[PDB]
From Swiss-Prot, chain B:
Compartment list: Host cytoplasm, Host perinuclear region; Host cytoplasm; Host endoplasmic reticulum
Originating species: Severe acute respiratory syndrome coronavirus 2
Amino-acid positions noted as binding Zn(2+) 7 in the UniProt annotation, renumbered to this chain: 57, 60, 66, 73
Protein name per Swiss-Prot or TrEMBL: Non-structural protein 10
Domain ExoN/MTase coactivator: 1-122
Subunit-level organization: Forms a dodecamer and interacts with nsp14 and nsp16; these interactions enhance nsp14 and nsp16 enzymatic activities.
Binding site for Zn(2+) 8: 100, 103, 111, 113
Highest taxon of source: Viruses
């Protein structure tokens, strides 16, 4: 009952320490749908609750923040999630989005094509993904292989991620990478609690493993949580938008070498008080296959 | 001197009984905003709905060039406030209306730059 007032529910830490056997995700509240505010799309409601929850975390929010959003195109050719991120993020935040098919966006720049065709010369402060690619319930690669590589090469230390997963759309390597953040969780939006969907949130990237995570076991732990803790569908949090905007912390950004990352630096990164990356001109590109 | 006139084509389509462009992205907001027409964040007042700008632009939605030399969009990356009575056709509203360059309110839907303001208040 108490969770219905929240934007959603984060997986309790005790589940991360178990070794569950994988099995079907069978939700008691499945097939159902929540009562959305008049004319509000499920994608706007879902992203609003994700941002409402991200507000409670130690996200680094530097001036000139850099955010990239994957899987941003809707079936109707617009970008509802991008519109919510731009509302949530401080004005002036650089926002780039991307998807497989054409769509019209409020993002500063939009890349169309397979996410594997996306290249950026710069590092990012936040990565959001709504990409969906399911597949026997074994670890799936495809865009998950790309996102694991993108996180390890283009995420600034201190940066965070919110990557959508489901019972069948997940990757063992992505769960292993959550151990490379100061903290992580699986977050279920209350408006979509009847789905196996969750956002894997990595908070404050350390660029190295703080904890060894077996991704196959951790997905089984996630499913066990969803199977045993029913989450009541709720749109309650969507009606009070007074504290919605991400607070501009003006988090310090500095370019330190890999050999200068000591324990004091790791401690600042872990508190959301530091971003490590150069602050060069943001340059992105989408590879084009040439064929006659 | 040929040039596609998308604006006139949409207005004629609406006058003939055509269904307005749909899937404009409506945002959640307090509805206690300034009520200005086009803002960096949702500013809907109690009589308006805030929408993602790109989704309410005829040119953006029809994948057509913007009718100005620099091909610049006044809506993309911003939020447009649409009177609730016109929220069923945000694209038609933005096309048919003009933002006051002085107060930033829609002309005929917020702009009071032309009112008397004769009796002053203490
Ligand atoms: Na904003
Ligand atoms: Na070709
Ligand atoms: Na109407
Ligand atoms: Na206009
Ligand atoms: Zn436009
Ligand atoms: Zn005016």
């Amino acid at each position: 009952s108490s969770q219905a007032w929240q934007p959603g529910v984060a997986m309790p830490n005790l589940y991360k320490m178990q070794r569950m056997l994988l099995e079907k995700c069978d939700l008691q509240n499945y097939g159902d749908s929540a009562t959305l505010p008049k004319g509000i799309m499920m994608n706007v409601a879902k992203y609003t609750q994700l941002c409402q929850y991200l507000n409670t975390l130690t996200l680094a929010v530097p001036y000139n923040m850099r955010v990239i959003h994957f899987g941003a195109g809707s079936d109707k050719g617009v970008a509802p999630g991008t519109a919510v991120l731009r509302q949530w993020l401080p004005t002036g935040t650089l926002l780039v989005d991307s998807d497989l098919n054409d769509f019209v966006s409020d993002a500063d720049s939009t890349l169309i094509g397979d996410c594997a065709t996306v290249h950026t010369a710069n590092k990012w402060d936040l990565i959001i993904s709504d990409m969906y690619d399911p597949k026997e319930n074994d670890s799936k690669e495809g865009f998950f292989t790309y996102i694991c590589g993108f996180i390890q090469q283009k995420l600034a230390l201190g940066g965070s991620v919110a990557i959508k997963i489901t019972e069948h759309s997940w990757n063992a390597d992505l769960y292993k990478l959550m151990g490379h953040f100061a903290w992580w969780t699986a977050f279920v939006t209350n408006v979509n609690a009847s789905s196996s969907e969750a956002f894997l949130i990595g908070c404050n990237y350390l660029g190295k493993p703080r904890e060894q995570i077996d991704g196959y076991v951790m997905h089984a732990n996630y499913i066990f949580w969803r199977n045993t803790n029913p989450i009541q569908l709720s749109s309650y949090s969507l009606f009070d938008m007074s504290k919605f905007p991400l607070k501009l912390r003006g988090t310090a950004v500095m370019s330190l070498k890999e050999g200068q990352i000591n324990d004091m630096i790791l401690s600042l990164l872990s508190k959301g008080r530091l971003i490590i990356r150069e602050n060069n001109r943001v340059v992105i590109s989408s590879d084009v296959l040439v064929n006659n | 001197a040929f040039a596609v006139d998308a604006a006139k084509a949409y207005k004629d389509y609406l006058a003939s009984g055509g269904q307005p462009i749909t899937n404009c992205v409506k945002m959640l907001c307090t509805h206690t905003g300034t009520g200005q027409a086009i803002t960096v964040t949702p500013e809907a007042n109690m009589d308006q709905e805030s929408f993602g700008g790109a989704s309410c632009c005829l040119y953006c939605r029809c994948h057509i060039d913007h009718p100005n030399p620099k091909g610049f969009c006044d809506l993309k990356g911003k939020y447009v406030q649409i009177p609730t009575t016109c929220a069923n056709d945000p694209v038609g509203f933005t096309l048919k209306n003009t933002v006051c360059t002085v107060c930033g309110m829609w002309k005929g839907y917020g702009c009071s730059c032309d009112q008397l303001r004769e009796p002053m208040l203490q």
